[PDB]
């Protein structure tokens, strides 16, 4: 689903009014949820999110 959504959107050239800026999007990757603790990364669980 996400790959089709990102592939469908096409970014055209950006011109304020020579130099021009164009952007593009590659493969979309999603990582597993992880809690960003102060000490180190920890496993994230649904009940941890519910309690916190």
């Amino acid at each position: 689903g996400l790959q089709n959504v990102f592939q469908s959107f096409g970014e055209m050239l950006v011109e304020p009014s020579w130099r021009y800026a164009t952007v593009k999007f590659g493969e979309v990757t999603v990582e597993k949820p992880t809690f960003f603790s102060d000490d180190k990364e920890l496993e994230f669980l649904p009940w941890h999110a519910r309690l916190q």
Partner: protein
Amino acid sequence: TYVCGDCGQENTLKSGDVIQCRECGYRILYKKRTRRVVQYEA
């Protein structure tokens, strides 16, 4: 005296900023039940 979650360790922390378990990384603590007499009617 407070009990941590997945890790077994007594917190015993009463400071306001102390919410994270010592020698641990999780911030979930359970209050421990002391030895107190409670009367119930059957």
